[PDB]
Amino acid sequence: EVSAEEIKKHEEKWNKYYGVNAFNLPKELFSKVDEKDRQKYPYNTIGNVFVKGQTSATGVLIGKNTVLTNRHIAKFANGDPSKVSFRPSINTDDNGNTETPYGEYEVKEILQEPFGAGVDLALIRLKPDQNGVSLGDKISPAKIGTSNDLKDGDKLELIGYPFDHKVNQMHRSEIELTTLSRGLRYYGFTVPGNSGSGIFNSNGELVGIHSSKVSHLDREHQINYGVGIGNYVKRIINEKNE
CATH number of the domain enclosing 123? 2.40.10.10
d(CA 141, CA 64): 7
Spell out the residues 6+ positions from residue 216 whose beta carbon is closer than 8 angstroms to its own: 10, 178, 179, 185, 222, 223
Looking at the structure, tell me whether residues 99 and 56 fall in a common domain.
yes
210 is catalytic: no
72 is catalytic: yes
Active-site hit among 89, 120, 165, 210: 120
Partner residues linked to 110 by β-bridges: 124
Active-site hit among 10, 56, 72, 134: 72
Q: Please name the method used to determine this structure.
A: X-ray
d(CA 27, CA 229): 27
Rg (CA), the chain: 17
Give the resolution value in Å. 1.7
Looking at the structure, tell me whether residues 71 and 137 fall in a common domain.
yes
Looking at the structure, tell me whether residues 9 and 118 fall in a common domain.
no
Structural domains in the chain (count): 2
Looking at the structure, tell me whether residues 108 and 62 fall in a common domain.
yes
Domain of 33, in residue numbers: 1-46+142-229
DSSP H or E run through 8: helix 4-18
Distance in angstroms between the alpha carbons of the first and the last residue of the chain: 45
171 is catalytic: no
Count how many Cα atoms sit within 13 Å of the Cα of residue 47 in the half-sphere of its side chain: 33
CB atoms within 10 A of CB 99: 13
Which parts of the chain are beta strand (E)? 30-32, 46-51, 55-61, 66-69, 84-88, 91-92, 98-99, 105-111, 122-126, 143-144, 155-160, 171-177, 184-187, 198-200, 205-216, 218-228
Looking at the structure, tell me whether residues 60 and 134 fall in a common domain.
yes
Question: Three-state SS for 74?
Answer: helix
Looking at the structure, tell me whether residues 94 and 132 fall in a common domain.
yes
Looking at the structure, tell me whether residues 137 and 53 fall in a common domain.
yes
What φ, ψ does residue 170 adopt, rounded to 5°? -60, 130
d(CA 164, CA 162): 6
Looking at the structure, tell me whether residues 57 and 127 fall in a common domain.
yes
Looking at the structure, tell me whether residues 220 and 156 fall in a common domain.
yes
Looking at the structure, tell me whether residues 92 and 127 fall in a common domain.
yes
Active-site hit among 85, 195, 197, 211: 195
Looking at the structure, tell me whether residues 72 and 42 fall in a common domain.
no
